[PDB]
Ligand SMILES: [Cl-]
Ligand SMILES: [Cl-]
Ligand SMILES: [Cu+2]
Ligand SMILES: [Cu+2]
């Protein structure tokens with residue numbers, strides 16, 4: 001199965017996020033290319049519960065967390081499903097990369113199809129911040145761009 | 154279950170399409186509000202197979218047609234699942250309305266979540282055109298706006 005999200009906003013940030021999962025049990029390969037970020041920085045990259053763009057990136061809601069856990073790093077046992085960590089940006093402010101994740105799926109009851117991918121203005125502290133905000137958003141700040149995850153060929 | 158699609162493009166047409174379905178067997182209520190169309194006209198309103206916006210509204214692909222039938226009116230027995238007919242525009246070019254459909258669903262294997270809603274520049278002949286193009290698109294012309302159907306609260 002294949003999915004795609006086109007990140008857009010009015011803050012100059014934009015990109016594309018592709019998703020690939022053969023079967024439910026197999027991890028999903030996430031591939032991204034996002035431009036217009038701050039150069040040489042780490043930016044929060046998350047999947048939110050709703051694919052609702054009626055009010056900018058805010059209507060996407062909280063991080064997808066069907067199991068009601070706290071915010072963590074993608075390598076953590078305790079993390080939200082939509083916790084993909086931080087993406088690195090180069091000297092030109094472009095973040096290009098790829099990775100696999102076993103909690104993010106395009107098939108089954110926890111499918112992210114129809115939900116939103118969000119890129120942050122700030123760095124995700126990965127839940128290690130000494131605040132309770134850290135346990136929900138990683139204190140990653142504003143959402144300059146987002147896109148609904150749709151199905152593709 | 155509730156879904157929503159925000160129609161956007163560079164042709165001045167835009168709007169919102171809401172979807173509501175309680176259970177699989179029950180019809181889905183489609184509610185829309187689209188502005189920027191030609192005034193006092195009928196415009197093709199369809200759901201396409203892919204929620205892919207990487208290339209404007211073109212990457213949405215053909216009308217959703219999992220049962221491989223020809224293009225028809227929503228009241229036809231032979232029609233594509235994404236065949237919602239034409240929406241009427243007023244003297245100000247706004248199309249506002251609502252309706253229920255039993256083939257369009259937000260639940261099950263034919264779910265439209267993650268697919269695209271498209272508004273046309275022209276009128277859907279409803280498959281009655283004397284061309285084979287009529288049997289696929291209804292000859293509705295260009296796609297000025299489209300949006301991915303995402304999940305919402
Ligand atoms: Cl977020
Ligand atoms: Cl079409
Ligand atoms: Cu976030
Ligand atoms: Cu069409």
Ligand SMILES: [Zn+2]
Pocket residue numbers: 046063070071072080082083136137138
């Ligand atoms: Zn999180």
Ligand SMILES: [Zn+2]
Pocket residue numbers: 199216223224225233235236289290291
């Ligand atoms: Zn059709």
